[PDB]
Design an enzyme around this catalytic site. Structure first.
Site, PDB file in Angstrom:
ATOM      1  N   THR A   1       0.778  -1.250   0.000  1.00 60.70           N
ATOM      2  CA  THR A   1       0.000   0.000   0.000  1.00 60.70           C
ATOM      3  C   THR A   1       0.794   1.275   0.000  1.00 60.70           C
ATOM      4  O   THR A   1       1.801   1.403   0.632  1.00 60.70           O
ATOM      5  CB  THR A   1      -0.881   0.073   1.212  1.00 60.70           C
ATOM      6  OG1 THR A   1      -1.678  -0.991   1.137  1.00 60.70           O
ATOM      7  CG2 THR A   1      -1.778   1.273   1.233  1.00 60.70           C
TER       8      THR A   1
ATOM      9  N   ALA B   1      -5.230  -6.047   5.620  1.00 58.79           N
ATOM     10  CA  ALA B   1      -6.477  -5.688   4.942  1.00 58.79           C
ATOM     11  C   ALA B   1      -7.701  -5.915   5.821  1.00 58.79           C
ATOM     12  O   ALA B   1      -8.536  -5.027   5.958  1.00 58.79           O
ATOM     13  CB  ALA B   1      -6.613  -6.464   3.642  1.00 58.79           C
TER      14      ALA B   1
END
Ligand SMILES: *[C@@](C)(CO)[C@](*)(O)[C@H](CC(C)C)NC(=O)[C@H](Cc1ccccc1)NC(=O)[C@H](CC(C)C)NC(=O)[C@H](CCc1ccccc1)NC(=O)CN1CCOCC1
Ligand SMILES: [Mg+2]
Lengths: 231, 195, 244, 222, 235, 212, 233, 240
Positions: free
Chosen positions: F1, F49
């Site tokens: 990310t 996540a």
């Protein structure tokens, strides 16, 4: 009199008055009828309303795909007991991959109600239940009373003026028991049975409540326009 | 969290605390205030494990403020430092201890004296004329041993503190992004905006 | 079940009173009178022992006056056994405070906590309240010399001079008459004994039927001393004021 | 030391169409280099037009499916026989998975069905409950083989319009149930060729508004 | 004395029956359900003129699609509302959807009989729960301390309930508009209220599918009160 | 990310990528890393996540319960602290979360809070979070000014994610843009790096390291 | 967290046209020591189910007691305990499968591999496996331990898929099982010559055979084998 | 644990224990709250049967819950301390989690919720206390005055009184307090509060306590002489 303060006290004649007062709550409740043949079992329930602006109190509750009951008396107590039955039916399925026998269902309810009649602080359940089901030994009908007493029957009725329907079924016993492989005729017999408990009022479309379970029929409830056929 | 310094002078306590907050290979912030006011005349700086530092500081702050409201009275720096030590002393034998080191700079209004307490995460309390936590002490203590005098003014203390920061900026491996300096005296707590 | 035998100790009357607290106060009104008088340079605690027997060991006895710490003492009125439960709790609380803050506990804080315990027994738990009224005499560096009282309700108030136990109505009137703000300890000692001497249900007030204590700054330079009077010391102070 | 996890192999595949959705999975069950069963289904009809498969460690997979099926049952009891929508099922499954965040179900979960607009829906979950709606997802042992092929053939990735100088992309369009089943079958035969834990049989569950249909195809048994 | 969960000889729970008497002493609350929405109105009933009437909160939001009105010992309703709000939000978290009005009501009514010797006594407050969902549309429920809830087309609770209910019996029909329902609540409230009805001592609210649950301003209600008086004088 | 959010003259820009990885395996290119808590509150997601997704949707429920109880929208500070106090309870258990709570209220104005799984909570004007944070910082810092226009600020946020998407192997997929104003958040589209890179390369004349 | 002490080796089984066959040797090993020789590892439940167990014998005996108690509990308040409401193989298996998985989930497993063989009330063959991990699977042939590696290949040559089951007689099926037990005796170092075999048929019911022996073994060729390469004598 | 249901319904629908708790409030010393245009004033009666008191150390009738909120009460003094403590703890807890001090409404709602909990919890009796909670919300200049009672109901008041002879002082406030124009200044608000207590108290010596609260944590308690000046001024205007 002096022996009705709680469930833990016996009267001098050996009676449990709190249990009897709980039994009285069922007599005030709206009439509901149960009956069965060899292939199917049927519940018929007269629903009650507060007034014309209100809805009609739902009397019938589904417990599993093959089992369910109708109630008479304190509805919240029926919700507790039906929820317990749902869990027991479900435990039998998850653990043993086995549909719960209607007879065991009755034994489990009996024992749950009994514990509330022998201990201080608690109170008896204030509701009567008619359990129907179809299991490995065919169609069944049970009558639950909050004293703990559970009874297997061909047909019965509980609630106000239930004696009329109960007398009818006692006369009709030989007829309706042999209604095999015919759902609509067994319901008709149940609708005619509950009609013997009516006074001034008649069976309307949002008043009548019917449920059925059988050999190739899951437990399903009929309300509204779906019961217009039987009026 | 890294550099926290404390200097007690004649009439005040001066706390200097680094502004850097670093995580990994990134300086996330360069204006972080590593201190909480426990009461009008008591200030606590802190350094240690991420999360624990602020959580502990604010927990102490809440407790001291609660005491102040209940008794309509300000606890002495000595009393606050003893309370803080006990909390850390409980913490070190807990399931997950607070890994936080603190300096408590306060001005006792009853004694009319400044007080500086150094407390580590184990609950090790000491009152000092000057104090430091972490690697800072390895430079500043010897420096202060030489230059410090007990009768110094607040201004002299700030110059003494500048001498510490300069040395740290010269010899420390990490860039700690300067310091926020606060002074605790008879008139309460105030921040030096230009350092 | 057990409901049948529950007295319901923590309920209101129709008039909004706590039955058990009121009846506990009635009990305390028959206990030996205890007087506290706060002077500018110290505090006096004086208490009358309950109908003494001649064969009672007087010197090694403690019924009324107890020490909570070096700076705080209490005079008891009511059930002694109940008082000792509360006294040990108060002693522990004082040590918890000292351990936490490295400072002796302020008088009011100790009094409030002890009064909060009493309050608890009137609002929850279903137990009878403590049949005890205290007179707290103590010193700290914030308010100096202080007198408080607490009762079974858990309500406490501060006083210049106060009585608890028997004949408080008569005792309070006499204290209110002769007390003044610029009073000394030695004068307060005389007032305490004179008040007991008049309000007592006994024929004559004697050394063996009394407990006495002072909290002065009479020690050497800026420090407080607690003096729990010995039998002979009470005998002397009783002669010195001209009661016997 | 006792190891509470195992690897039962196999692979699963979900594709969503315009008015349908498929959830496929091979029927082989294995441990190490041994075959446990050539026909052990791991794609299940859970009611309310929801099909589900939890591939990986079969014990956890069966436990999860069992718990979700039960969740559907109680959803009916508690909410007046209301139909559990695919999006609501997905969120419910997240909580089942994340409930064991610190002792996870070692499975990759995929569910398929129709959304509330009647359009085909596929949701995929990681072992601890992170989920996402997609047109396309392969899961399990051969996911790394099948998934890039699906990107190319279902979502037309890296495919440009001929003669447009790689400027205009191949336009996205829904696939027919016939074309989707061709891709599923070719995906599984390809995975069977190159992955030792994949083979024996292929079972596809197709979901439309009419209900849940099944199709079975043989796969190589080596 | 006697047990809290004791049955009377007639087969009723003493405490539940006694709590119903407390609800009769409460201020009036009326609800009317239509195909365009559900209206909820209450009598504020300030005990003194110095009391700031806008602080009287007897109509309450549970979620965007569910509203609630109360009558009786209103302090008891706080934990019921707290439970309802948590139940509504918790269901949205678990299922990514709005919760059915009936299911919400059932969750509140499960608290009712959780008393004995759990809390020490039944609730001394009745609730009118109004809302909307996709399945059963606009709904009005009357939740009692007995654990029982009835669905109603229209319902009045509180001190002027039996008089107001008889009036709602005649006035309600299935084709009522939202505006007609608003005026009908104000009309019936004004009849049963002790003091004269105005915007300060009476409050209106409604729940619609489009805009959700909304408590009306005192300016908006004042116009409806003025509109109501004019229409009654017009014939 | 890679995620970022920065404060400027015209409010807040928030920009995130959409990649999700399991080791070197690219598991998804279409993940939503911005959570829309309410019309005035956003939350960014980086790290685990499930941890981020689960607990930030839980945060939204807690923020909703606040405005029901208090009849007022929750402050950005109070919202971020609910999350920071939550993850602090789990400290040492192995949660992996790097989040930013971005929003506007009347009393606070535009506000950004950095909140991570080891308990760190920081207010600030600029943050970049995730494995690609450094690559975003490089472009963002060297082009950042307070007086950027809404148009230039939106582009810089987009360009910074693109930079990280390019250099960091664990970032990519597409860029999601948000702009937070006094009137609430405004979505500014999903931008696929597949087309965006070449469009930016050609128009800007940058990325000369790549074979054109 | 356990370690198995006294252990039982392979359990092997297969379906045939009218029912199922299951077999297991009578050995209780103690590491490399072949300690106990009279151990019965096939346990019948009613007249329609046989549970074959391998692995830890102390845990096997615990499972015996559970199954024994299950029969008792099922009889309580059950007039049809020997008829419609009798214990099915599917009920017995699901119960064990529940227990095995619960125990693994508490990090305290029953260190066993179990095969539940039987015939349902409707005549259907039941054969399903469960182990210490709670992993379950079904197949026309099932085997545990070395049986999985050596017996399954042989049994699958007879019944390779579902359609081969009606074509397989009890004579052919038993012959394969007995052959597999011989092969296991040749090649499994923790096996014994003595074993038990159980047949559950939908017509003839439960047939439990004890004290069987591996026989018709080939050892004669061993005399010709000299040395390990070159050696001629 | 002691479980008895002490607070229960009676045949007529009343909870006598809660109603008897109100009688305890009616016995308590009078307390009055009056809010002006830019301030709130809390007046409190102190009974004069207690001479030889030490007013330095005796618990004050008005208590600070936070630097911006105050709480006065009528009824059982011991009971009030428990509510005050809980309120003070909640005030600090709110600052810790919300990073903002409590609103007066929130603090009232909390205290009222505690009182309610004791009306349907087993083994406990209701608080024999009614409170007046007053102050100013953070960064706000609108005065707030709330009342709570044993049952747990709470509400906002322009002016209110509780305790013994409160019906007399409420009668006074109802005609003397104008909603359209509240006391514009601090002096006007204090005077009206003192006037209202002088209808009931007896003498205006050491019987009346006055506490003034202003915006931004500006709270101060008036001394004897300061209060006596209001008493002297009112009596001279009365003789007319
Ligand atoms: C960039 C991409 C750097 O990661 C971002 O930070 C994104 C953030 C978005 C997605 C919110 N983070 C990830 O992509 C994150 C990276 C990561 C991985 C593992 C631990 C921490 C961080 N990825 C994930 O969380 C993936 C997402 C899946 C692929 C959709 N999940 C996993 O890797 C999962 C669960 C990890 C886990 C955590 C805690 C307890 C148990 C498990 N693991 C697997 O899927 C395992 N594995 C995948 C391949 O097949 C075998 C099973
Ligand atoms: Mg293969």
């Amino acid at each position: 009199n002096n022996y009705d303060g709680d469930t833990v006290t016996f009267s001098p004649t050996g009676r449990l008055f709190q249990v009897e007062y709980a039994l009285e709550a069922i007599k005030q409740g709206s009439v509901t009828v149960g009956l069965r043949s060899n292939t199917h079992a049927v519940l018929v329930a007269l629903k009650r309303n507060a007034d014309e602006l209100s809805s009609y109190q739902k009397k019938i509750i589904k417990c599993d795909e093959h089992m369910g009951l109708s109630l008479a008396g304190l509805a919240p107590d029926a919700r507790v007991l039906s929820n317990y039955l749902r869990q027991q039916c479900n435990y039998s399925s998850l653990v043993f991959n086995r549909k719960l026998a209607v007879e065991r269902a009755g034994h489990l309810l009996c024992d749950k109600a009994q514990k509330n009649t022998q201990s201080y602080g608690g109170r008896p359940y204030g509701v009567g239940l008619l359990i129907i089901g179809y299991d490995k030994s065919g169609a069944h009908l049970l009558e639950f009373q909050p004293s703990g007493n559970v009874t297997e029957l061909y047909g019965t009725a509980i609630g106000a003026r239930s004696q009329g329907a109960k007398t009818y079924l006692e006369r009709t016993l030989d007829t309706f028991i042999k209604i095999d492989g015919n759902p609509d005729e067994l319901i008709k017999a149940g609708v005619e049975a509950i009609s013997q408990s009516l006074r001034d009022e008649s069976l309307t479309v949002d008043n009548l409540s019917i449920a059925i379970v059988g050999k190739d029929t899951p437990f399903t409830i009929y309300d509204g326009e779906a019961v217009a056929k039987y009026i | 969290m890294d550099i926290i310094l404390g200097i007690r002078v004649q009439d005040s306590v001066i706390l200097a605390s680094s502004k850097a907050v670093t995580r990994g290979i990134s300086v996330l912030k360069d204006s972080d205030d590593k201190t909480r006011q426990l009461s009008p005349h008591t200030l606590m700086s802190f350094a240690g494990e991420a999360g624990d530092t602020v959580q502990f500081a604010e927990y102490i702050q809440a407790n001291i403020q609660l005491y102040s409201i209940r008794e309509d009275y300000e606890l002495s720096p000595q009393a606050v430092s003893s309370f803080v030590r006990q909390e850390l002393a409980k913490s070190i034998r807990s399931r997950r201890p607070y890994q936080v080191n603190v300096l408590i700079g306060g001005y006792d209004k009853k004694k009319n004296k400044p007080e500086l307490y150094q407390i580590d995460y184990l609950g090790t309390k000491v009152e000092l004329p000057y104090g430091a936590h972490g690697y800072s002490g390895f430079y500043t203590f010897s420096l202060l041993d030489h230059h410090y005098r007990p009768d110094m003014t607040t201004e002299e203390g700030l110059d003494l503190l500048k001498l510490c920061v300069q040395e740290l900026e010269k010899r420390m491996p990490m860039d700690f992004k300067g310091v926020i300096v606060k002074i605790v005296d008879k008139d309460g707590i105030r921040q030096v905006d230009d350092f | 079940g057990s409901r049948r035998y529950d007295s319901r100790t923590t309920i209101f009357s129709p008039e909004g009173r706590l039955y058990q607290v009121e009846y506990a106060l009635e009990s305390i009104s028959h206990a030996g009178t205890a007087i506290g008088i706060m002077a500018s340079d110290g505090i006096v605690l004086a208490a009358e022992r309950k109908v003494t027997s001649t064969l009672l060991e007087q010197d090694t006895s403690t019924e009324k006056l107890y020490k909570l710490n070096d700076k705080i003492a209490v005079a008891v009125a009511g059930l002694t056994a109940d008082a000792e439960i509360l006294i040990n709790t108060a002693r522990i609380h004082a040590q918890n405070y000292l351990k936490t803050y490295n400072e002796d506990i302020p008088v009011e804080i100790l009094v409030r906590r002890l009064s909060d315990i009493k309050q608890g027994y009137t609002q929850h738990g279903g137990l009878r309240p403590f049949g005890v009224s205290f007179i707290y005499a103590g010193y700290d560096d914030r308010y100096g010399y202080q007198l408080y009282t607490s009762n079974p309700s858990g309500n406490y108030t501060g006083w210049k001079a106060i009585s608890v136990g028997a004949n408080t109505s008569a005792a309070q009137t006499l204290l209110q008459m002769d007390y003044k703000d610029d009073m000394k300890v030695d004068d307060a000692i005389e007032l305490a004994l004179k008040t007991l001497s008049k309000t007592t249900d006994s024929s004559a007030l004697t050394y063996d039927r009394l407990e006495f204590a002072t909290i002065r700054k009479g020690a050497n330079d800026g420090e407080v001393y607690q003096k729990i009077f010995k039998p002979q010391e009470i005998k002397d102070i009783l002669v010195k004021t001209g009661i016997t | 030391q006792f190891n509470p996890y195992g690897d039962n192999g196999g692979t699963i595949l979900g594709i969503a169409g315009e008015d349908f959705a498929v959830l496929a999975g091979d029927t082989r069950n294995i441990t190490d280099y041994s075959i446990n069963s050539r026909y052990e289904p791991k794609v299940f009809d859970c009611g309310d037009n929801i099909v589900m498969s939890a591939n990986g460690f079969a014990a956890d997979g069966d436990a999860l499916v069992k718990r979700f099926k039960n969740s559907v049952k109680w959803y009916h009891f508690d909410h007046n026989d209301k139909k559990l929508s695919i999006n609501s099922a997905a969120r419910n499954i997240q909580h089942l998975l994340y409930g064991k965040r610190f002792f996870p179900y070692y499975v990759h979960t995929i569910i398929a069905g129709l959304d509330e607009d009647g359009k085909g829906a596929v949701y995929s979950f990681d072992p601890v409950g992170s989920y996402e709606r997609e047109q396309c997802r392969a899961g399990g042992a051969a996911a790394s083989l099948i998934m890039p092929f699906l990107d190319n053939q279902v979502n037309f990735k890296n495919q440009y319009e001929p003669g447009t100088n790689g400027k205009v992309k191949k336009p996205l369009k829904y696939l027919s149930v016939e074309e989707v089943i061709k891709l599923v079958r070719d995906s599984f035969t390809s995975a069977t060729e190159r992955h030792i834990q994949v083979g024996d049989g292929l079972e596809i569950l197709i979901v439309t508004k009419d209900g849940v249909r099944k199709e079975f195809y043989e796969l190589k048994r080596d | 004395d006697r047990g809290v969960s004791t049955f009377s000889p007639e087969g009723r729970l003493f405490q539940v029956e006694y709590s119903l008497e407390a609800i009769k002493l409460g201020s009036t609350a009326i609800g009317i359900a239509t195909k365009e929405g559900v209206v909820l109105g209450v009598e504020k009933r300030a005990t003194s003129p110095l009391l700031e009437s806008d602080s009287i909160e007897k109509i309450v939001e549970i979620d965007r699609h569910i509203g609630c009105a109360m009558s009786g010992l209103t302090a008891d309703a706080r934990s019921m509302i707290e439970h309802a709000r948590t139940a509504a939000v918790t269901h949205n978290l678990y299922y990514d959807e709005d919760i059915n009005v009936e299911s919400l009501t059932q969750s509140v009514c499960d608290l009712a009989l959780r008393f004995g010797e759990l809390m020490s006594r039944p609730f001394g407050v009745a609730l009118l729960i109004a809302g909307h969902d996709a399945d059963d549309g606009y709904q009005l429920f009357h939740a009692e301390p007995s654990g029982t809830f009835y669905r109603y087309n229209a319902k009045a609770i509180g001190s002027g309930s039996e008089g107001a209910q008889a009036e709602l019996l005649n006035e309600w029909h299935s084709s009522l508009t939202l505006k007609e329902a608003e005026l009908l609540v104000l009309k019936i409230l004004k009849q049963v209220m002790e003091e004269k009805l105005d915007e300060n001592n009476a409050q209106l609210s409604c729940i619609t599918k489009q805009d959700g649950f909304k408590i009306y301003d005192n300016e908006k209600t004042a116009e409806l009160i003025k509109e109501l008086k004019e229409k009654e004088a017009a014939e | 990310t890679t995620t970022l959010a920065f404060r400027f003259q015209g409010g807040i820009i928030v920009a995130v990528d959409s990649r999700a990885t399991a080791g070197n395996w690219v598991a998804s290119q279409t993940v939503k890393k911005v959570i829309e808590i309410n019309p005035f509150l956003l939350g960014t997601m980086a790290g685990g996540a499930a941890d981020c997704q689960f607990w930030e949707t839980w945060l939204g429920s807690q923020c909703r319960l606040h405005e029901l109880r208090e009849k007022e929208r929750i402050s950005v500070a109070a919202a971020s602290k609910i999350l920071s106090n939550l993850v602090y309870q789990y400290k040492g258990a192995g949660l992996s979360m790097g989040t930013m709570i971005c929003g506007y209220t009347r009393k606070e104005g535009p506000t950004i809070y950095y909140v991570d799984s080891d308990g760190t909570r920081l207010k600030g004007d600029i943050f970049c979070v995730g494995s690609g944070q450094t690559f975003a910082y490089g472009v963002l810092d060297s082009n950042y000014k307070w007086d950027l226009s809404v148009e230039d600020a939106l582009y810089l946020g987009k360009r910074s994610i693109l930079a990280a998407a390019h250099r960091n192997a664990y970032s990519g997929g597409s860029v999601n843009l948000y702009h937070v104003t006094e009137d609430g958040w405004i979505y500014h589209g999903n931008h696929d790096v597949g087309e965006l890179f070449w469009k930016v390369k050609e128009e800007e004349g940058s990325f000369n390291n790549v074979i054109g | 967290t356990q370690q198995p002490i006294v252990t039982g080796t392979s359990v092997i089984s297969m379906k045939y046209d009218n029912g199922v066959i299951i077999a297991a040797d009578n050995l209780g090993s103690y590491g490399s020591l072949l300690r106990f020789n009279g151990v019965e590892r096939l346990i019948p439940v009613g007249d329609n189910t046989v549970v074959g167990i391998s692995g830890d014998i102390s845990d096997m005996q615990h499972i015996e007691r559970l199954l024994k108690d299950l029969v008792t509990e099922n009889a309580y308040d059950n007039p049809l305990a020997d008829a419609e409401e009798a214990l099915e193989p599917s009920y017995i298996f699901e119960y064990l499968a529940t227990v095995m998985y619960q125990r693994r989930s508490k990090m305290n497993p029953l260190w066993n591999a179990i095969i539940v063989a039987g015939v349902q009330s409707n005549g259907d063959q039941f054969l399903r496996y469960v182990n210490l991990l709670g992993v379950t699977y079904s197949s026309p042939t099932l085997a545990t331990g070395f049986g999985a590696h050596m017996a399954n290949p042989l049994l699958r040559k007879v019944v390779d898929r579902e359609s081969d089951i009606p074509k397989t007689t009890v004579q052919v099926a038993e012959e394969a099982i007995v052959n597999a037990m011989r092969v296991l005796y040749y090649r499994d170092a923790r096996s014994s010559r003595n074993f038990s075999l159980a047949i559950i048929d939908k017509n003839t019911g439960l047939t439990f055979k004890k004290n069987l022996q591996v026989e018709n073994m080939k050892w004669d060729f061993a005399k010709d084998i000299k040395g390990y390469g070159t050696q001629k004598i | 644990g002691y479980d008895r249901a002490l607070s229960i319904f009676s045949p007529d629908g009343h909870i006598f224990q809660v109603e008897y708790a109100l009688e305890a409030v009616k016995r308590g010393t009078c307390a009055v709250g009056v809010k002006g245009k830019n301030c709130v004033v809390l007046g409190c009666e102190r009974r004069s049967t207690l001479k030889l008191q030490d007013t330095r150390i005796t618990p004050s009738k008005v208590s600070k819950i936070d630097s911006h909120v105050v709480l006065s009460f009528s009824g059982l003094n011991a009971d009030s301390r428990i509510l005050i403590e809980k309120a003070r703890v909640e005030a600090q807890s709110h600052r810790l989690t919300l990073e903002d001090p409590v609103t007066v409404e929130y603090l009232t709602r909390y205290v009222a919720g505690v009182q309610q909990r004791y009306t349907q919890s087993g083994g406990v009796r209701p608080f024999g206390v009614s409170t007046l909670i007053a102050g100013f919300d953070p960064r706000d200049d609108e005065p707030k005055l709330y009342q709570t009672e044993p049952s747990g109901i709470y509400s906002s008041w322009s002016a209110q009184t509780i305790g013994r002879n409160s019906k007399t002082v409420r009668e006074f406030l109802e005609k003397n307090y104008d909603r359209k124009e509240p006391p514009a200044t601090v002096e006007e608000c204090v005077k009206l509060t003192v006037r209202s207590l002088l209808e009931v108290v007896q003498t205006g010596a050491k019987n009346i306590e006055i506490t003034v609260v202003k915006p931004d944590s500006d709270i101060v308690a008036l001394s004897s002489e300061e209060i006596n000046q209001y008493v002297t001024q009112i009596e001279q205007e009365k003789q007319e």
